[PDB]
Design a protein that fits this description.
Radius of gyration of chain A: 13 Å
Order of helices and strands of chain A: HEEHE
Strand content of chain A: 15-25%
Structural class of chain A: alpha+beta
Subcellular location (chains A, B, C, D, E, F, G, H, I, J, K, L, M, N, O, P, Q, R, S, T, U): Cell inner membrane; Bacterial flagellum basal body
Largest interface: B-C, 29 and 26 residues
Number of helices of chain A: 2
PDB class: motor protein
Function (chains A, B, C, D, E, F, G, H, I, J, K, L, M, N, O, P, Q, R, S, T, U): The M ring may be actively involved in energy transduction.
Number of strands of chain A: 3
Helix content of chain A: 25-40%
Number of domains of chain A: 1
Strand order of the largest sheet of chain A: 1-2-3
Shape of chain A: globular
Family (chains A, B, C, D, E, F, G, H, I, J, K, L, M, N, O, P, Q, R, S, T, U): Belongs to the FliF family.
Oligomer: homo-oligomer of 21 chains
Protein name (chains A, B, C, D, E, F, G, H, I, J, K, L, M, N, O, P, Q, R, S, T, U): Flagellar M-ring protein
Chain lengths: 88, 88, 88, 88, 88, 88, 88, 88, 88, 88, 88, 88, 88, 88, 88, 88, 88, 88, 88, 88, 88
């Protein structure tokens, strides 16, 4: 009951990442989920010479807050490849 | 009871995506469902040089809110390939 | 008890779609059902150069609301291949 | 107890359809039943250049409302091959 | 207990039909029974150039209402091959 | 306990019919029984150019009402090969 | 417990018939019993050019009412090969 | 417990008959017993040109009423080969 | 417990008969017992040209009433080969 | 427990008879016992031209009343080969 | 527990008899016991031309009343080969 | 528990007899015991031309009353080969 | 538990006898024990031309009363080979 | 539990005897024990021409009363080979 | 239930480390989690000649506080390769 | 539990005897123990021409009273080879 | 449940040590954990000619206090290769 | 549980004896223990021409009273090879 | 549950010793733990010509008090190779 | 549970003895323990021409009182090879 | 649970001894533990021509009191190879 609850999450994370990857100014993403009070942390490498606008942050935040059961958009952490914690 | 509840969802998501794909200005979609309080997140790549009108958003939102049991149209997140969180 | 409840639905959806297909100005349909409070979402591609009249919407809506147990005609979503959410 | 309750219905529907087919101005019918509060939806293709009169609707409606246990004639939906929801 | 309750009915229907067939102005009949509050629906093709008189309707109605347990003659629906719902 | 309760009836019906057949102005009979409140329906083809008198109806009615347990002579339906519901 | 209760009756009926056959003006008889409130129905073909007198009816009626447990002589139905319900 | 209770009776009847046969003016007898409130019915063919006197009836009646447990001499029915119900 | 209770009786009857046979004016006897309230019925063929005196009846009656448990001499029926019920 | 209770009696009877046989004016005896309230019936053929005196009856009566458990000398029936019930 | 209780008695009787045989004026004896309230019956053939005196009766009576458990000397019946019930 | 209780007695009797045999004026003895209230019966053949004195009776009586458990010397019966019940 | 309780006694008796044999004026003894209230009976053949004195009786009586559990010296019976009950 | 309780005693007796044998004026002893209230009986053959003094009796009495559990010296019986009960 | 709870953590730690590694001024990281009140400790080797700014600390702290269930950002310890405890 | 409780005693007795044997004026001893209230009896053959002094008796008495559990020195019986009960 | 709880700790200790090793002025570390109220003891060999500053102690203390569940930074003991207990 | 409790004692006794043997003026000892209230009895053969002093008795008494659990020095009996009970 | 609790301790002791060995003025250590209220005892051989300072004692004491669960630094005993109990 | 409790003691005794042997003026010792209230008895052979001083007694007494659980130094008995109970 | 509790102690004792051996003026030690209220006894052979000072006693006493669970330093007994109980 456990070794495929965490093997499901291992692919949901790898699926959520492959969609954020196909999002324009995101060369590669890397999601981790914390499903017990849930939360997630997305690390994105933007395309060389780009920067996510303030609305493009809610794109990725909601793109993840909705794909996971019970995770509000406030518990999602977005981080570039240059530090830069984007989501408050 | 679990490994085919989430294997059902894996095809419902891939079925819901193949119908939104056949919707005109949608070159490819990518759905994720959060079924415990449900919600979904659709990421669509529009046809090159197109943009979903304000009524075409309710098309895709209801096209998904109805294909899933108990998911209201407010919990559906639509996102382009250019950020642009379309559904409030 | 599960893997053929959802395998029944997989054919009911594919049966309901093949009848709407044989409906005149409907080149191909694509039904999804949400059976727990039920609802359905039909996506139809009309014949090239056609448009469903206001009574032809109640045709397809009732053609689906009756073929599924407990689904009222208000919970059925009809959508063209051009956005156009037809059922309110 | 399930896989032949719905395999019974799969033939009752295909039997009810083959009798409506042998009804004069009906080139082919296509019945779906919703047996939990029951209801049915008949889609008929009329013979080329025909139209069901107002009494011929009660023919097909009662021809189906009686062949199914507990289904009143008000819950039967009849639809042509040209939209045209015939039963109110 | 089920797959021969409905396999009994499948022959009772086919037996009741072969007797109505041997009834004079009835070239072929086709009975369906609804046994849970029972009811039946007979569709008869009359001999070419004939029509069932008002007493010949009670013949076929009672010929069926009595061959089935608990089915009153009011719940029997008789229909020609030309629409024409004969039994009220 | 079922598949030979209805296989008994299948021969009782075929036995009751072969005795009515040997009854003079009856070229062939065809009985169906409804044994749960019982009832029966006899369809007789009279000899060419004959007609059952009013007492010959009580012959066949009692010939059947007595051969079946609990079936009164009022619940027996007799019908010719020409419509003609004989028993009220 | 059933398939030889009704296989006993199948021979008792065929035994009761072979004794009535050896009764003078009875060329062949044919008995059916209704054993749950019992009753029986005898159909006799009289010798060519004979007729059972009013006392010869009580012969056959008691010849059957006594050979079956609990069957009064009032529940026995005697019928010729010419209609003619003999026992009231 | 049943198939030799009625196989006992089948020989008791055939034994009781072979003794009445050896009784003078009785060329052959034929007994049937009704053992649940018991009763019996004897059919005797008298020797050609004979007739049982009024005391010879109590012979055969008691010859049977005593050979069966609990059967009074009033429940025994004696019948010739010419109708003629002898025992009241 | 049954098939040799009645197989015991089958020899007791055949033993009781072989002793009455060796009784002088009795060429052959034939006993039947009714053992549930018991009773018996003896049929004797007297030697050609003999007749049992009034005391010779109590011989055979007691010869049987005592050889069977609980059978009084009043429940024993003696009958000649010429009718003639001897025991009241 | 039964088939040798009555197989014991079958030899006790045949033993009691072989002793009465060796009793002088008794050429052969034949005993039957009724053991549930017991009783017995002895049939004796006296030597040709002899007759049991009144005391020789109590010989045979007590010779049997004592060899059987619980059988009083009043329930023993003695009978010659010429009728003649000897014991009252 | 039974077939050697009565096989014990079968030898006790044959042992008691072989001792009375060795008693002088007793050429052969023959004992039967009635062991449930016990009793016995001795039949003795005296030596040719002898007779048991009144004290020789108590010899044989006590010779048997004591060899059997619970049998008083009053329940022992002694009988010669010439009738002659010796013990009162 | 029985077939060697009475096989013990069969040797105790044969042992008690072989000691009385070695007693002087006793050519052979023959003991029977009645062990349920016990008693015994000794039959002795005295040496030719001898007779047991009044004290020699208490010898044999006590020689037996003591060799058996619970048997008083009053319940022991001694008998010669010439009748002569010696013990009162 | 029985067949060696009485096989023990069979040797104790034969042991007690072989010691009394070695006692001077006792050529051979023969003991029987009655062990349920116990008692014993010794029969001794004295040496030819001897007689046990009054004290030699208490020798043999106590020689036996003590070798058996619970047997008082009053319940021991001593008897010569010439009658002569020695112990009161 | 029994066949070696009495096989123990069989050697204790034979051991107790072999020690009394080695006691001077005792050529051979022979002990029997009565172990349920115990007691013993010693029979000693003294050396030819000897006699046990009054103290030599307490030797043998205590030599046995102590070698057996619970046996007082009053319940030990000592007897010579010449009668002579030594212990009171 | 244990050896893969801590084998899950062994990869989550190695996954969390490979994402912090792809973060710009982080040449290699090394995470340890303390999941019972959780906490984590990250040791990072910065790129040669770099230093994490004060906002780049909240990047790595939230990048870890969110990827683990229930771990607040206060319980995360960040340390360089030169001592330098960065998180208070 | 028994056959080595008394096989232990058989060696304890033979061990206790071999130590008293090695005691000076004791050529051979012979002990028997009575272990249920215990007691013992020692028989000693003194060296030819010796006699145990009054203190040498307490030697052997205590040498045995102590080697056995619960046996006081008063219950030990010492006896020479010449009678002579030494211990009171 | 034990042999891999302490085999987990054996690697956590060896993992925690390999990270402190990669910390600059730490040539090799050696951790031991005390997990029941937990505590740990780190022994570090500094690089030749170095010394941990006062902030570099909180580095290693928190680097360990956080990698272990429930271990406060006060229960962590740090020691050089030259004595020098660094953590109070 | 028994056969090595007394096999332990068999060696403890043989061990205790081999130590007293190595005690100077003791050429050989021989111990017996009474372990249920314990006690022991030591028999010692002193070296030729020696005698145990009054303190050498407490040596051997305590050498044994202490080597056995619960045995006081008062329950130990010491005896020479010349009688001489040494311990009071 | 035991043989590896003490086999764990056997390596923890050998691990704790190998770290104290790598501590500078400690050529070899040797730890023993007392884990039930725990305590430990360290014996250290210092490098030839060295001595642990007063702070170097708290090094080794805390290096051990922390590596073991629940062991305070007061229950740790440190001892040189020259006596010298260092920890109070 | 027993045969190695006393096999443990057999080596503890042999171990305790081999240490006292290595004690200077003790050429060989021999310990016995009494472990149920424990006690021990040591027998020591001193080196030829030595004697244990008053403090050397407490050496051996405590050397044994401490090596055994619960044994006070007062219950230890020390004895030389010359009698001489050393411990009071 | 026992044979390795005392096999653990057998090595703990042999381990504790090998550390005291490496203690300077201790050529060899020999420890015994008493673990039920524990205690131990150490016997040490000092190096030839040495003597443990008063502080070197607390070294060895605490070196043992701490290596064993629950053993205070007062219950440890230290003894040289020359008597000399060192620990009070």
């Amino acid at each position: 009951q456990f070794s495929e609850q965490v093997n499901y999450q291992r692919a949901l994370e790898g699926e959520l990442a492959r969609t954020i990857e196909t999002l324009g100014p995101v060369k590669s993403a890397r999601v981790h989920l914390a499903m017990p009070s849930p939360s997630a942390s997305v690390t994105v490498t933007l395309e060389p010479g780009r920067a996510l606008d303030e609305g493009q942050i809610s794109a990725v935040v909601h793109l993840v807050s909705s794909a996971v059961a019970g995770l509000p958009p406030g518990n999602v952490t977005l981080v570039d490849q240059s530090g830069h914690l984007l989501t408050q």
